[PDB]
Structure formats: structure tokens, C-alpha cells
Amino acid sequence: TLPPAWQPFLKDHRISTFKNWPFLEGCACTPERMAEAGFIHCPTENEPDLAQCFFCFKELEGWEPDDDPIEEHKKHSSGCAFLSVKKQFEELTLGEFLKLDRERAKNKIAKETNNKKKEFEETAKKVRRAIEQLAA
């Protein structure tokens, strides 16, 4: 088998992650077509159709059956490197693969930072509002 951390590089693992994905047979954003685009299904309560690139970590809710997940990926995250991987996985080299994984680990960190930032600006707003009300 393949080291679990490295698993989302696998189209078939990514597919397997779609569990009760609403858009099946007749749709353009089918789990197959979705995994092919690098998404994994990571549903929440308020967001049951939440999908995420395993590589750039962009997150997209609000899918419509006519959406082409590739086109939708170039749109909301053109910078993503997986988008450029022409080759099929096992056609890669370990060298090429490790380059890619390093970039993933970097994008992940980049994403963590980015969230911590929003969390920070959220807390700020609360503090601002409070102080204002307290001065009023």
C-alpha cells in the first residue's frame, strides 16, 4: 500500500472520499470528474457540499450540477500547481513527486497562516465593537 500522508495524490483515493456527493450520473461535477480536478469531499454541517483541493487547499461550496470542476479550479485558484501536472501519477518520477509534495507542504502552511489571519481579524472586530459600545 501507499503511505497515508501521500494518499490524496491518488485519484482513486480522492474519489473514495466523496460520500453522499449529491451530483452523480447526469452531472458534470461527478465525483470522478471532481477527483480528477484534485478535490476531496470534506462536508460540514452548514456546508455538506464543501470540496477542497488536496494540493492548494482552496475550498469551494455551492456546487451546481453543470459546473466543470477543472474550469472551476482554474478560476478560484489559478495559481495551483497540480493544475499543471500533465502526467499521470505513476508516470512521474520520485524527484518530480517530492518537488510537488514540498509545494503542498508549503501551500498547507501558507493556508494555515491565511486562516490564523482571518481568525485574528475576527477577534479584532469583536474587540473594536466592544470598545466602541463601552465608550458610547
Partner: peptide, 6 residues
């Protein structure tokens, strides 16, 4: 689709 919010 949309970029996630909140």
C-alpha cells in the same frame, strides 16, 4: 461554485 465563507 463559491469560495467558502466563515
Amino acid at each position: 461554485a463559491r469560495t467558502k465563507q466563515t
